[PDB]
Amino acid sequence: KVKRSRKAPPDGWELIEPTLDELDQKMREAETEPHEGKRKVESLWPIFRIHHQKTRYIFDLFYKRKAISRELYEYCIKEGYADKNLIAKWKKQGYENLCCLRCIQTRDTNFGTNCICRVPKSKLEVGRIIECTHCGCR
Amino acid sequence: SNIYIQEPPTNGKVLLKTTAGDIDIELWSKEAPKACRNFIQLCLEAYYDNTIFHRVVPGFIVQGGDPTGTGSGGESIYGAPFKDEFHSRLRFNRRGLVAMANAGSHDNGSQFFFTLGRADELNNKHTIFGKVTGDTVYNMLRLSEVDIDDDERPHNPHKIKSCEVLFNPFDDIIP
Amino acid sequence: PFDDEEPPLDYADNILDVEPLEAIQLELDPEEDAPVLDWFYDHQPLRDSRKYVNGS
Amino acid sequence: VYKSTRSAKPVGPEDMGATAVYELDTEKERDAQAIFERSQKIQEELRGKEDDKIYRGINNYQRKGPIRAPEHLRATVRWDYQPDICKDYKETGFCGFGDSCKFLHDRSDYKHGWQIERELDECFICRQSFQNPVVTKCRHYFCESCALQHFRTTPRCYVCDQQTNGVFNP
RNA sequence: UCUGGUUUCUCUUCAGAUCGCAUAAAUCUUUCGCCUUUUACUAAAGAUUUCCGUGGAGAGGAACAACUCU
RNA sequence: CGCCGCCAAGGUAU
Ligand SMILES: [Mg+2]
Ligand SMILES: [Zn+2]
Ligand SMILES: [Zn+2]
Ligand SMILES: [Zn+2]
Ligand SMILES: [Zn+2]
């Protein structure tokens, strides 16, 4: 695959290589299929979901578990297996169960506000199974 | 020149011997990993010995890969049939192509077919995973005789006597 | 390089895993090109270094 | 049967057509530009010699002409379907311009290319069995007793009322 | 002992400096050269803009902001 | 001391 860093990266990359390879294969399988049945945007939900779970895997691999080093963490950010600005949003106090970056953009919404995905369910009304049209669910 | 072969380059080649002659099938292992994997595995298991060609539609298709000879016997080495793997550069615009035979959804096993012409009705429906090197395509053009007795299954169908593997990437084992 | 009635190669499943072969990549020897050896072939020559460049 | 060579190399070149040579005309060392270059060169070398009569060839007694094709190129071909036909001379027989019209003056109304393209893509009287089927003067195959009862009805035939004239044969 | 700040992202007008150590097109008004009428034109001057970028300035954050210039 | 490299509307009616 494309590595674009000529690094021959250090430890530990051999233990995350088949896991992230399987996540890349499932991301290709979520990219490949046609849009029949999936209406307009719900074919675009699982690629956001799998990038979220890949970034969360690197997130609790480095911050929570403290097993992988900082150099290979910055390497995985620089290559494309993780984000740089999204983990800075996960670093903040009030939220780390975030969907993706399309609910924080207050001018993506024409009414000048955040989405309904970033709302606590206990203060929202009781039974509604609402899902974000930009991000996918909550 | 202006011939424009219009196909991605191949990787991996196998030899297949029938009573009609020798066929050197070269595969697209990169553009179709699982189908080529199943094909090289069933060639390495010597699974296609005594396998006959049970369906001939002249000018359109000639089907093989059935150890039973009825048109429904297909057993992959995966336990379950695998997915369809399509490509925009791999279409049915010519003869000499090899594709897994399908019956609707993601159902592909040992059951495959050679092409005999223009097959535009099969586009985005079957998994192309290989072609045949020319100077040997007439050994499979001898497979299309009008001796069929029915829509399929002629009198004496040709059988595969051996299946050699000339190049073998992603090393596998027979079980 | 490619004929008519052909889509432009569909860069999702063609060469996404294919590595490039080789660029020009002139071999610089050490002890004569030693300060420039680490960064002469880099799309950003100096970007994340406040000693030589301004910034990003 | 066509036996194979048993090799791992594929069917053709590795570049898949990236070095098309376009050798339709005369090749590089034999082209007229190369002949003119050789003639010009040997006229540049032999200068102090004054008629040494080894004569060197035909053109050497003392890049224009056939110019070399670009070897790295196919010409971008287009199908010029549109004809220039004198319609008023074709379907009518009199063009108003006479010989001053720029078009063809053709009258062959044959098929064009696109038309070929979109054409290539696609007893009885009693209604019983033949109880002795027997004939009359005028081919009318009747029965025996049924035609006897028919003659008892009318002296003529049944299909076209032909004059049987008492003539009834097998 | 007190004094205490480089980058990145968004508005804010001024530009008179080879604003850019280089340099595109269009319009008008004239002179030409191909020209049948015109758009495509030729190439010189005069004067306007458009456009790819740039210069210094007011704020709001964030990025090691606490390393430390003072 | 070495110009010059060409498209279309103008015609087979509405
Ligand atoms: Mg007029
Ligand atoms: Zn969220
Ligand atoms: Zn999201
Ligand atoms: Zn949302
Ligand atoms: Zn005319």
mmCIF file with all atom_site columns, all heavy atoms in Angstrom, chain E residues 36-39, chain F residues 6-10:
data_model
loop_
_atom_site.group_PDB
_atom_site.id
_atom_site.type_symbol
_atom_site.label_atom_id
_atom_site.label_alt_id
_atom_site.label_comp_id
_atom_site.label_asym_id
_atom_site.label_entity_id
_atom_site.label_seq_id
_atom_site.pdbx_PDB_ins_code
_atom_site.Cartn_x
_atom_site.Cartn_y
_atom_site.Cartn_z
_atom_site.occupancy
_atom_site.B_iso_or_equiv
_atom_site.pdbx_formal_charge
_atom_site.auth_seq_id
_atom_site.auth_comp_id
_atom_site.auth_asym_id
_atom_site.auth_atom_id
_atom_site.pdbx_PDB_model_num
ATOM 1   P P     . U E 1 36 ? -10.726 39.504 -49.987 1.00 0.00 ? 36 U E P     1
ATOM 2   O OP1   . U E 1 36 ? -11.762 38.533 -50.417 1.00 0.00 ? 36 U E OP1   1
ATOM 3   O OP2   . U E 1 36 ? -9.444  39.592 -50.719 1.00 0.00 ? 36 U E OP2   1
ATOM 4   O "O5'" . U E 1 36 ? -11.358 40.962 -50.009 1.00 0.00 ? 36 U E "O5'" 1
ATOM 5   C "C5'" . U E 1 36 ? -12.476 41.256 -50.836 1.00 0.00 ? 36 U E "C5'" 1
ATOM 6   C "C4'" . U E 1 36 ? -13.688 41.634 -50.022 1.00 0.00 ? 36 U E "C4'" 1
ATOM 7   O "O4'" . U E 1 36 ? -14.669 40.561 -50.102 1.00 0.00 ? 36 U E "O4'" 1
ATOM 8   C "C3'" . U E 1 36 ? -13.436 41.874 -48.532 1.00 0.00 ? 36 U E "C3'" 1
ATOM 9   O "O3'" . U E 1 36 ? -14.306 42.912 -48.075 1.00 0.00 ? 36 U E "O3'" 1
ATOM 10  C "C2'" . U E 1 36 ? -13.845 40.540 -47.910 1.00 0.00 ? 36 U E "C2'" 1
ATOM 11  O "O2'" . U E 1 36 ? -14.203 40.595 -46.546 1.00 0.00 ? 36 U E "O2'" 1
ATOM 12  C "C1'" . U E 1 36 ? -15.017 40.136 -48.799 1.00 0.00 ? 36 U E "C1'" 1
ATOM 13  N N1    . U E 1 36 ? -15.270 38.687 -48.830 1.00 0.00 ? 36 U E N1    1
ATOM 14  C C2    . U E 1 36 ? -16.552 38.264 -49.128 1.00 0.00 ? 36 U E C2    1
ATOM 15  O O2    . U E 1 36 ? -17.461 39.034 -49.383 1.00 0.00 ? 36 U E O2    1
ATOM 16  N N3    . U E 1 36 ? -16.725 36.901 -49.127 1.00 0.00 ? 36 U E N3    1
ATOM 17  C C4    . U E 1 36 ? -15.772 35.942 -48.854 1.00 0.00 ? 36 U E C4    1
ATOM 18  O O4    . U E 1 36 ? -16.082 34.750 -48.891 1.00 0.00 ? 36 U E O4    1
ATOM 19  C C5    . U E 1 36 ? -14.476 36.458 -48.544 1.00 0.00 ? 36 U E C5    1
ATOM 20  C C6    . U E 1 36 ? -14.277 37.779 -48.541 1.00 0.00 ? 36 U E C6    1
ATOM 21  P P     . U E 1 37 ? -13.955 43.783 -46.766 1.00 0.00 ? 37 U E P     1
ATOM 22  O OP1   . U E 1 37 ? -13.582 45.151 -47.202 1.00 0.00 ? 37 U E OP1   1
ATOM 23  O OP2   . U E 1 37 ? -13.010 43.025 -45.908 1.00 0.00 ? 37 U E OP2   1
ATOM 24  O "O5'" . U E 1 37 ? -15.353 43.861 -46.006 1.00 0.00 ? 37 U E "O5'" 1
ATOM 25  C "C5'" . U E 1 37 ? -16.466 43.125 -46.492 1.00 0.00 ? 37 U E "C5'" 1
ATOM 26  C "C4'" . U E 1 37 ? -17.480 42.834 -45.415 1.00 0.00 ? 37 U E "C4'" 1
ATOM 27  O "O4'" . U E 1 37 ? -18.243 41.655 -45.791 1.00 0.00 ? 37 U E "O4'" 1
ATOM 28  C "C3'" . U E 1 37 ? -16.923 42.488 -44.042 1.00 0.00 ? 37 U E "C3'" 1
ATOM 29  O "O3'" . U E 1 37 ? -16.571 43.629 -43.278 1.00 0.00 ? 37 U E "O3'" 1
ATOM 30  C "C2'" . U E 1 37 ? -18.044 41.661 -43.424 1.00 0.00 ? 37 U E "C2'" 1
ATOM 31  O "O2'" . U E 1 37 ? -19.077 42.503 -42.935 1.00 0.00 ? 37 U E "O2'" 1
ATOM 32  C "C1'" . U E 1 37 ? -18.576 40.904 -44.642 1.00 0.00 ? 37 U E "C1'" 1
ATOM 33  N N1    . U E 1 37 ? -17.998 39.541 -44.764 1.00 0.00 ? 37 U E N1    1
ATOM 34  C C2    . U E 1 37 ? -18.556 38.514 -44.019 1.00 0.00 ? 37 U E C2    1
ATOM 35  O O2    . U E 1 37 ? -19.502 38.673 -43.265 1.00 0.00 ? 37 U E O2    1
ATOM 36  N N3    . U E 1 37 ? -17.967 37.280 -44.187 1.00 0.00 ? 37 U E N3    1
ATOM 37  C C4    . U E 1 37 ? -16.898 36.978 -45.008 1.00 0.00 ? 37 U E C4    1
ATOM 38  O O4    . U E 1 37 ? -16.457 35.833 -45.074 1.00 0.00 ? 37 U E O4    1
ATOM 39  C C5    . U E 1 37 ? -16.380 38.085 -45.737 1.00 0.00 ? 37 U E C5    1
ATOM 40  C C6    . U E 1 37 ? -16.937 39.284 -45.600 1.00 0.00 ? 37 U E C6    1
ATOM 41  P P     . U E 1 38 ? -15.330 43.568 -42.258 1.00 0.00 ? 38 U E P     1
ATOM 42  O OP1   . U E 1 38 ? -15.092 44.940 -41.744 1.00 0.00 ? 38 U E OP1   1
ATOM 43  O OP2   . U E 1 38 ? -14.224 42.830 -42.919 1.00 0.00 ? 38 U E OP2   1
ATOM 44  O "O5'" . U E 1 38 ? -15.860 42.676 -41.048 1.00 0.00 ? 38 U E "O5'" 1
ATOM 45  C "C5'" . U E 1 38 ? -16.906 43.137 -40.205 1.00 0.00 ? 38 U E "C5'" 1
ATOM 46  C "C4'" . U E 1 38 ? -17.456 42.026 -39.345 1.00 0.00 ? 38 U E "C4'" 1
ATOM 47  O "O4'" . U E 1 38 ? -17.928 40.940 -40.183 1.00 0.00 ? 38 U E "O4'" 1
ATOM 48  C "C3'" . U E 1 38 ? -16.467 41.359 -38.403 1.00 0.00 ? 38 U E "C3'" 1
ATOM 49  O "O3'" . U E 1 38 ? -16.249 42.101 -37.216 1.00 0.00 ? 38 U E "O3'" 1
ATOM 50  C "C2'" . U E 1 38 ? -17.105 39.997 -38.160 1.00 0.00 ? 38 U E "C2'" 1
ATOM 51  O "O2'" . U E 1 38 ? -18.131 40.090 -37.184 1.00 0.00 ? 38 U E "O2'" 1
ATOM 52  C "C1'" . U E 1 38 ? -17.753 39.706 -39.516 1.00 0.00 ? 38 U E "C1'" 1
ATOM 53  N N1    . U E 1 38 ? -16.935 38.799 -40.360 1.00 0.00 ? 38 U E N1    1
ATOM 54  C C2    . U E 1 38 ? -17.036 37.434 -40.135 1.00 0.00 ? 38 U E C2    1
ATOM 55  O O2    . U E 1 38 ? -17.760 36.951 -39.281 1.00 0.00 ? 38 U E O2    1
ATOM 56  N N3    . U E 1 38 ? -16.258 36.641 -40.946 1.00 0.00 ? 38 U E N3    1
ATOM 57  C C4    . U E 1 38 ? -15.405 37.071 -41.944 1.00 0.00 ? 38 U E C4    1
ATOM 58  O O4    . U E 1 38 ? -14.764 36.250 -42.602 1.00 0.00 ? 38 U E O4    1
ATOM 59  C C5    . U E 1 38 ? -15.357 38.489 -42.118 1.00 0.00 ? 38 U E C5    1
ATOM 60  C C6    . U E 1 38 ? -16.103 39.283 -41.344 1.00 0.00 ? 38 U E C6    1
ATOM 61  P P     . U E 1 39 ? -14.840 42.010 -36.449 1.00 0.00 ? 39 U E P     1
ATOM 62  O OP1   . U E 1 39 ? -14.734 43.183 -35.546 1.00 0.00 ? 39 U E OP1   1
ATOM 63  O OP2   . U E 1 39 ? -13.781 41.762 -37.461 1.00 0.00 ? 39 U E OP2   1
ATOM 64  O "O5'" . U E 1 39 ? -14.973 40.704 -35.545 1.00 0.00 ? 39 U E "O5'" 1
ATOM 65  C "C5'" . U E 1 39 ? -15.941 40.630 -34.509 1.00 0.00 ? 39 U E "C5'" 1
ATOM 66  C "C4'" . U E 1 39 ? -16.230 39.202 -34.121 1.00 0.00 ? 39 U E "C4'" 1
ATOM 67  O "O4'" . U E 1 39 ? -16.548 38.431 -35.309 1.00 0.00 ? 39 U E "O4'" 1
ATOM 68  C "C3'" . U E 1 39 ? -15.084 38.437 -33.481 1.00 0.00 ? 39 U E "C3'" 1
ATOM 69  O "O3'" . U E 1 39 ? -14.942 38.708 -32.097 1.00 0.00 ? 39 U E "O3'" 1
ATOM 70  C "C2'" . U E 1 39 ? -15.435 36.984 -33.785 1.00 0.00 ? 39 U E "C2'" 1
ATOM 71  O "O2'" . U E 1 39 ? -16.408 36.502 -32.869 1.00 0.00 ? 39 U E "O2'" 1
ATOM 72  C "C1'" . U E 1 39 ? -16.087 37.104 -35.164 1.00 0.00 ? 39 U E "C1'" 1
ATOM 73  N N1    . U E 1 39 ? -15.151 36.791 -36.272 1.00 0.00 ? 39 U E N1    1
ATOM 74  C C2    . U E 1 39 ? -14.984 35.459 -36.610 1.00 0.00 ? 39 U E C2    1
ATOM 75  O O2    . U E 1 39 ? -15.560 34.548 -36.041 1.00 0.00 ? 39 U E O2    1
ATOM 76  N N3    . U E 1 39 ? -14.111 35.226 -37.644 1.00 0.00 ? 39 U E N3    1
ATOM 77  C C4    . U E 1 39 ? -13.403 36.162 -38.366 1.00 0.00 ? 39 U E C4    1
ATOM 78  O O4    . U E 1 39 ? -12.654 35.791 -39.271 1.00 0.00 ? 39 U E O4    1
ATOM 79  C C5    . U E 1 39 ? -13.628 37.515 -37.964 1.00 0.00 ? 39 U E C5    1
ATOM 80  C C6    . U E 1 39 ? -14.472 37.772 -36.961 1.00 0.00 ? 39 U E C6    1
ATOM 81  P P     . C F 2 6  ? -2.692  27.752 -40.771 1.00 0.00 ? 6  C F P     1
ATOM 82  O OP1   . C F 2 6  ? -3.246  26.378 -40.862 1.00 0.00 ? 6  C F OP1   1
ATOM 83  O OP2   . C F 2 6  ? -2.713  28.623 -41.972 1.00 0.00 ? 6  C F OP2   1
ATOM 84  O "O5'" . C F 2 6  ? -3.450  28.537 -39.610 1.00 0.00 ? 6  C F "O5'" 1
ATOM 85  C "C5'" . C F 2 6  ? -4.024  27.843 -38.506 1.00 0.00 ? 6  C F "C5'" 1
ATOM 86  C "C4'" . C F 2 6  ? -5.534  27.903 -38.513 1.00 0.00 ? 6  C F "C4'" 1
ATOM 87  O "O4'" . C F 2 6  ? -5.967  29.271 -38.757 1.00 0.00 ? 6  C F "O4'" 1
ATOM 88  C "C3'" . C F 2 6  ? -6.227  27.043 -39.570 1.00 0.00 ? 6  C F "C3'" 1
ATOM 89  O "O3'" . C F 2 6  ? -7.451  26.539 -39.039 1.00 0.00 ? 6  C F "O3'" 1
ATOM 90  C "C2'" . C F 2 6  ? -6.525  28.046 -40.680 1.00 0.00 ? 6  C F "C2'" 1
ATOM 91  O "O2'" . C F 2 6  ? -7.600  27.689 -41.523 1.00 0.00 ? 6  C F "O2'" 1
ATOM 92  C "C1'" . C F 2 6  ? -6.832  29.306 -39.876 1.00 0.00 ? 6  C F "C1'" 1
ATOM 93  N N1    . C F 2 6  ? -6.594  30.561 -40.604 1.00 0.00 ? 6  C F N1    1
ATOM 94  C C2    . C F 2 6  ? -7.620  31.090 -41.392 1.00 0.00 ? 6  C F C2    1
ATOM 95  O O2    . C F 2 6  ? -8.697  30.481 -41.468 1.00 0.00 ? 6  C F O2    1
ATOM 96  N N3    . C F 2 6  ? -7.409  32.248 -42.060 1.00 0.00 ? 6  C F N3    1
ATOM 97  C C4    . C F 2 6  ? -6.237  32.875 -41.956 1.00 0.00 ? 6  C F C4    1
ATOM 98  N N4    . C F 2 6  ? -6.076  34.015 -42.632 1.00 0.00 ? 6  C F N4    1
ATOM 99  C C5    . C F 2 6  ? -5.177  32.362 -41.155 1.00 0.00 ? 6  C F C5    1
ATOM 100 C C6    . C F 2 6  ? -5.397  31.214 -40.501 1.00 0.00 ? 6  C F C6    1
ATOM 101 P P     . C F 2 7  ? -7.752  24.961 -39.064 1.00 0.00 ? 7  C F P     1
ATOM 102 O OP1   . C F 2 7  ? -7.792  24.479 -37.662 1.00 0.00 ? 7  C F OP1   1
ATOM 103 O OP2   . C F 2 7  ? -6.819  24.327 -40.030 1.00 0.00 ? 7  C F OP2   1
ATOM 104 O "O5'" . C F 2 7  ? -9.226  24.863 -39.661 1.00 0.00 ? 7  C F "O5'" 1
ATOM 105 C "C5'" . C F 2 7  ? -10.003 26.032 -39.873 1.00 0.00 ? 7  C F "C5'" 1
ATOM 106 C "C4'" . C F 2 7  ? -10.920 26.298 -38.707 1.00 0.00 ? 7  C F "C4'" 1
ATOM 107 O "O4'" . C F 2 7  ? -10.530 27.525 -38.038 1.00 0.00 ? 7  C F "O4'" 1
ATOM 108 C "C3'" . C F 2 7  ? -12.385 26.517 -39.046 1.00 0.00 ? 7  C F "C3'" 1
ATOM 109 O "O3'" . C F 2 7  ? -13.086 25.307 -39.272 1.00 0.00 ? 7  C F "O3'" 1
ATOM 110 C "C2'" . C F 2 7  ? -12.892 27.306 -37.844 1.00 0.00 ? 7  C F "C2'" 1
ATOM 111 O "O2'" . C F 2 7  ? -13.165 26.442 -36.752 1.00 0.00 ? 7  C F "O2'" 1
ATOM 112 C "C1'" . C F 2 7  ? -11.668 28.161 -37.495 1.00 0.00 ? 7  C F "C1'" 1
ATOM 113 N N1    . C F 2 7  ? -11.765 29.541 -38.032 1.00 0.00 ? 7  C F N1    1
ATOM 114 C C2    . C F 2 7  ? -12.453 30.503 -37.281 1.00 0.00 ? 7  C F C2    1
ATOM 115 O O2    . C F 2 7  ? -12.957 30.181 -36.195 1.00 0.00 ? 7  C F O2    1
ATOM 116 N N3    . C F 2 7  ? -12.551 31.768 -37.752 1.00 0.00 ? 7  C F N3    1
ATOM 117 C C4    . C F 2 7  ? -11.999 32.092 -38.922 1.00 0.00 ? 7  C F C4    1
ATOM 118 N N4    . C F 2 7  ? -12.120 33.352 -39.348 1.00 0.00 ? 7  C F N4    1
ATOM 119 C C5    . C F 2 7  ? -11.295 31.140 -39.708 1.00 0.00 ? 7  C F C5    1
ATOM 120 C C6    . C F 2 7  ? -11.201 29.893 -39.230 1.00 0.00 ? 7  C F C6    1
ATOM 121 P P     . A F 2 8  ? -14.114 25.193 -40.500 1.00 0.00 ? 8  A F P     1
ATOM 122 O OP1   . A F 2 8  ? -14.562 23.781 -40.598 1.00 0.00 ? 8  A F OP1   1
ATOM 123 O OP2   . A F 2 8  ? -13.493 25.850 -41.679 1.00 0.00 ? 8  A F OP2   1
ATOM 124 O "O5'" . A F 2 8  ? -15.358 26.075 -40.043 1.00 0.00 ? 8  A F "O5'" 1
ATOM 125 C "C5'" . A F 2 8  ? -16.142 25.695 -38.922 1.00 0.00 ? 8  A F "C5'" 1
ATOM 126 C "C4'" . A F 2 8  ? -16.989 26.835 -38.415 1.00 0.00 ? 8  A F "C4'" 1
ATOM 127 O "O4'" . A F 2 8  ? -16.146 27.957 -38.047 1.00 0.00 ? 8  A F "O4'" 1
ATOM 128 C "C3'" . A F 2 8  ? -17.981 27.437 -39.397 1.00 0.00 ? 8  A F "C3'" 1
ATOM 129 O "O3'" . A F 2 8  ? -19.159 26.664 -39.541 1.00 0.00 ? 8  A F "O3'" 1
ATOM 130 C "C2'" . A F 2 8  ? -18.224 28.818 -38.806 1.00 0.00 ? 8  A F "C2'" 1
ATOM 131 O "O2'" . A F 2 8  ? -19.107 28.736 -37.700 1.00 0.00 ? 8  A F "O2'" 1
ATOM 132 C "C1'" . A F 2 8  ? -16.830 29.170 -38.283 1.00 0.00 ? 8  A F "C1'" 1
ATOM 133 N N9    . A F 2 8  ? -16.053 29.984 -39.241 1.00 0.00 ? 8  A F N9    1
ATOM 134 C C8    . A F 2 8  ? -15.156 29.548 -40.186 1.00 0.00 ? 8  A F C8    1
ATOM 135 N N7    . A F 2 8  ? -14.622 30.519 -40.887 1.00 0.00 ? 8  A F N7    1
ATOM 136 C C5    . A F 2 8  ? -15.202 31.669 -40.371 1.00 0.00 ? 8  A F C5    1
ATOM 137 C C6    . A F 2 8  ? -15.050 33.036 -40.689 1.00 0.00 ? 8  A F C6    1
ATOM 138 N N6    . A F 2 8  ? -14.235 33.487 -41.646 1.00 0.00 ? 8  A F N6    1
ATOM 139 N N1    . A F 2 8  ? -15.775 33.940 -39.988 1.00 0.00 ? 8  A F N1    1
ATOM 140 C C2    . A F 2 8  ? -16.597 33.490 -39.026 1.00 0.00 ? 8  A F C2    1
ATOM 141 N N3    . A F 2 8  ? -16.822 32.233 -38.636 1.00 0.00 ? 8  A F N3    1
ATOM 142 C C4    . A F 2 8  ? -16.088 31.358 -39.354 1.00 0.00 ? 8  A F C4    1
ATOM 143 P P     . A F 2 9  ? -19.973 26.686 -40.926 1.00 0.00 ? 9  A F P     1
ATOM 144 O OP1   . A F 2 9  ? -20.879 25.512 -40.947 1.00 0.00 ? 9  A F OP1   1
ATOM 145 O OP2   . A F 2 9  ? -19.003 26.877 -42.035 1.00 0.00 ? 9  A F OP2   1
ATOM 146 O "O5'" . A F 2 9  ? -20.862 28.004 -40.827 1.00 0.00 ? 9  A F "O5'" 1
ATOM 147 C "C5'" . A F 2 9  ? -21.921 28.100 -39.885 1.00 0.00 ? 9  A F "C5'" 1
ATOM 148 C "C4'" . A F 2 9  ? -22.510 29.488 -39.851 1.00 0.00 ? 9  A F "C4'" 1
ATOM 149 O "O4'" . A F 2 9  ? -21.515 30.430 -39.373 1.00 0.00 ? 9  A F "O4'" 1
ATOM 150 C "C3'" . A F 2 9  ? -22.952 30.061 -41.189 1.00 0.00 ? 9  A F "C3'" 1
ATOM 151 O "O3'" . A F 2 9  ? -24.234 29.610 -41.589 1.00 0.00 ? 9  A F "O3'" 1
ATOM 152 C "C2'" . A F 2 9  ? -22.889 31.563 -40.944 1.00 0.00 ? 9  A F "C2'" 1
ATOM 153 O "O2'" . A F 2 9  ? -24.031 31.996 -40.223 1.00 0.00 ? 9  A F "O2'" 1
ATOM 154 C "C1'" . A F 2 9  ? -21.671 31.672 -40.028 1.00 0.00 ? 9  A F "C1'" 1
ATOM 155 N N9    . A F 2 9  ? -20.439 31.955 -40.785 1.00 0.00 ? 9  A F N9    1
ATOM 156 C C8    . A F 2 9  ? -19.502 31.043 -41.199 1.00 0.00 ? 9  A F C8    1
ATOM 157 N N7    . A F 2 9  ? -18.502 31.566 -41.858 1.00 0.00 ? 9  A F N7    1
ATOM 158 C C5    . A F 2 9  ? -18.810 32.916 -41.885 1.00 0.00 ? 9  A F C5    1
ATOM 159 C C6    . A F 2 9  ? -18.142 34.014 -42.442 1.00 0.00 ? 9  A F C6    1
ATOM 160 N N6    . A F 2 9  ? -16.989 33.891 -43.088 1.00 0.00 ? 9  A F N6    1
ATOM 161 N N1    . A F 2 9  ? -18.692 35.240 -42.306 1.00 0.00 ? 9  A F N1    1
ATOM 162 C C2    . A F 2 9  ? -19.854 35.352 -41.647 1.00 0.00 ? 9  A F C2    1
ATOM 163 N N3    . A F 2 9  ? -20.580 34.386 -41.075 1.00 0.00 ? 9  A F N3    1
ATOM 164 C C4    . A F 2 9  ? -19.997 33.179 -41.232 1.00 0.00 ? 9  A F C4    1
ATOM 165 P P     . G F 2 10 ? -24.447 28.926 -43.029 1.00 0.00 ? 10 G F P     1
ATOM 166 O OP1   . G F 2 10 ? -25.895 28.634 -43.188 1.00 0.00 ? 10 G F OP1   1
ATOM 167 O OP2   . G F 2 10 ? -23.461 27.823 -43.156 1.00 0.00 ? 10 G F OP2   1
ATOM 168 O "O5'" . G F 2 10 ? -24.051 30.064 -44.072 1.00 0.00 ? 10 G F "O5'" 1
ATOM 169 C "C5'" . G F 2 10 ? -24.817 31.256 -44.197 1.00 0.00 ? 10 G F "C5'" 1
ATOM 170 C "C4'" . G F 2 10 ? -24.172 32.217 -45.165 1.00 0.00 ? 10 G F "C4'" 1
ATOM 171 O "O4'" . G F 2 10 ? -22.782 32.409 -44.792 1.00 0.00 ? 10 G F "O4'" 1
ATOM 172 C "C3'" . G F 2 10 ? -24.115 31.751 -46.613 1.00 0.00 ? 10 G F "C3'" 1
ATOM 173 O "O3'" . G F 2 10 ? -25.313 32.022 -47.323 1.00 0.00 ? 10 G F "O3'" 1
ATOM 174 C "C2'" . G F 2 10 ? -22.899 32.483 -47.165 1.00 0.00 ? 10 G F "C2'" 1
ATOM 175 O "O2'" . G F 2 10 ? -23.233 33.820 -47.513 1.00 0.00 ? 10 G F "O2'" 1
ATOM 176 C "C1'" . G F 2 10 ? -21.977 32.521 -45.946 1.00 0.00 ? 10 G F "C1'" 1
ATOM 177 N N9    . G F 2 10 ? -20.973 31.433 -45.920 1.00 0.00 ? 10 G F N9    1
ATOM 178 C C8    . G F 2 10 ? -21.183 30.076 -45.823 1.00 0.00 ? 10 G F C8    1
ATOM 179 N N7    . G F 2 10 ? -20.084 29.376 -45.790 1.00 0.00 ? 10 G F N7    1
ATOM 180 C C5    . G F 2 10 ? -19.077 30.327 -45.851 1.00 0.00 ? 10 G F C5    1
ATOM 181 C C6    . G F 2 10 ? -17.668 30.166 -45.849 1.00 0.00 ? 10 G F C6    1
ATOM 182 O O6    . G F 2 10 ? -17.009 29.121 -45.793 1.00 0.00 ? 10 G F O6    1
ATOM 183 N N1    . G F 2 10 ? -17.016 31.391 -45.923 1.00 0.00 ? 10 G F N1    1
ATOM 184 C C2    . G F 2 10 ? -17.638 32.612 -45.992 1.00 0.00 ? 10 G F C2    1
ATOM 185 N N2    . G F 2 10 ? -16.829 33.678 -46.065 1.00 0.00 ? 10 G F N2    1
ATOM 186 N N3    . G F 2 10 ? -18.951 32.776 -45.993 1.00 0.00 ? 10 G F N3    1
ATOM 187 C C4    . G F 2 10 ? -19.607 31.598 -45.920 1.00 0.00 ? 10 G F C4    1
#
